[PDB]
Structure formats: C-alpha cells, structure tokens
C-alpha cells in the first residue's frame, strides 16, 4: 500500500564523488531501511530505522529522512560501492520496497563495436534463422538498436540481452537477435543492424546480403 519511489533509478559516479539517493514514500513512514545488493549476493543491510548504521558497513554511508522523503548518502564514493540500493519502509504493513537505484561507475564515453552475423547454414538446415548483432564495449549504457529488412524497419522477433557493467573497463555490451522462420528469411535479401548511441549523431550501420 505504501509505495516507495527511488530516484534516480540509474546514476553514475566516480571514486571521490558524493552520492545521494532518494526514496519518496506515498505516505508517512516512521522507519526506513536501506539495503545494498550486487549480482549473486543477498541484500546487505546498511541502514536500520532511518538513520542507524548497520554493522560492518563503512562510515561513509549515512541515512536520513522524515515523513515522506528519505535519503541515503555516500560521503565519498569508492569503486566497490557500485551496486543497486533498495529502500524499505518498516512503518506499516504490508512491508514494501522501492524499485531500487542502480549506482554504476563512470568512465570515458565509448562507441559500441557493432558486428552483424547471418544465420549459420547449420541453423537453416535445422529450420530456423537467427540474425545476431553484437554491440560491444560501449558507454554510457543507453543505446538504441533498430533492425531493418530490405530497408524497412522490423520490430517483431527481436530479443535483446545486456551484460552487467564490466568489472575491468566499466563498459557495457549488448546482443540483439532477430529470429525469423527460414521461409521469411529467404523471402528478403538485405538485413541491417543499426545502433544509435550518444557518441555520434550518425547511427552505426552494419548489414549483409545473402550471397
């Protein structure tokens, strides 16, 4: 019933920066909790009862807020604080969580390396036809992809998958797969993967023609 809204859902920081994440409640909350979570790990308590520091967590963290607005702060960001952060109200039942705030690491902008691959002869022999497009090692995470068949846009049959921020170079990578039946694929000739990214006003276009 109490809805918690964390903003920004996504934010970036580099070591040394001050980070503030907010949690806005739909009604008055008397006690706010905060948890940290990285992929493959249980939620880790950071703040209990709004402003109390949980055990084993560093003094750069602090919780505050009252009524309907609450905040979690990292006085000086360190790299190992890259994670998602959840607020949870323990004021009225049912207990509810916010959708979380993703805290990612900042780095220089990087254009995606785009590669398009036609369906293998093996898959066509099997009856299917998947057209795969890789968009690797780009930053920031925001990227747009468009599939075109014979110069015409296509949306159905597209499945996208994203990696988590690389722990070595902090970039992101994405795969886009256009799945057509063998009949549809053989009906057209030109297939294009177009990637739009802030690192350029012109999209990066990769394509092939069956021959």
């Amino acid at each position: 019933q109490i809805v918690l809204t964390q903003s920004p859902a996504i934010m970036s920081a580099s070591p040394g920066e001050k980070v503030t994440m907010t949690c806005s409640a739909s009604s008055s909350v008397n006690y706010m909790y905060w948890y940290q979570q990285k992929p493959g790990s249980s939620p880790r308590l950071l703040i209990y009862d709004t402003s109390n520091l949980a055990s084993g967590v560093p003094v750069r963290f602090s919780g505050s807020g009252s009524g309907t607005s609450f905040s979690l702060t990292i006085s000086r960001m360190e790299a190992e604080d890259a994670a998602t952060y959840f607020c949870q109200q323990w004021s009225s039942y049912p207990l509810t969580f916010g959708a979380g705030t993703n805290l990612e690491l900042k780095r220089a902008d990087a254009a995606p390396t785009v590669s398009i691959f036609p369906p293998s002869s093996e898959q066509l022999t099997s009856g299917g036809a998947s057209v795969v497009c890789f968009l690797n090692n780009f930053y920031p995470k925001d990227i747009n992809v468009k599939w075109k068949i014979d110069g015409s846009e296509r949306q159905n049959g597209v499945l996208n998958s994203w990696t988590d921020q690389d722990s070595k170079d902090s970039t992101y990578s994405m795969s886009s797969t256009l799945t057509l039946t063998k009949d549809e694929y053989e009906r057209h000739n030109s297939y294009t993967c177009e990637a739009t990214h802030k690192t350029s006003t012109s999209p990066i276009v990769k394509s092939f023609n069956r021959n």
Binding site: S42, P43, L45, Y48, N52, L53, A54, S55, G56, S115, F117, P119, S120, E122, Q123, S126, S130, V132
Partner: peptide, 28 residues
C-alpha cells in the same frame, strides 16, 4: 545492528523438459 538472510532458493516454474542446446557458429 546486523540482520540475517538466507542464501536464497531459486524457483523455476516451467513445463519444459531437459533439452541439450543447439550450437551454431557466427561467422562474418
């Protein structure tokens, strides 16, 4: 100052049968 969580149990609700993958090569 410390709560306690279990390691979690993963639940997958599906009607599929154990199926081996098809492996297709992606060449330029």
């Amino acid at each position: 100052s410390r709560d306690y969580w279990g390691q979690g149990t993963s639940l997958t609700v599906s009607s599929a049968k154990t199926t081996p993958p098809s492996v297709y090569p992606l060449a330029p």
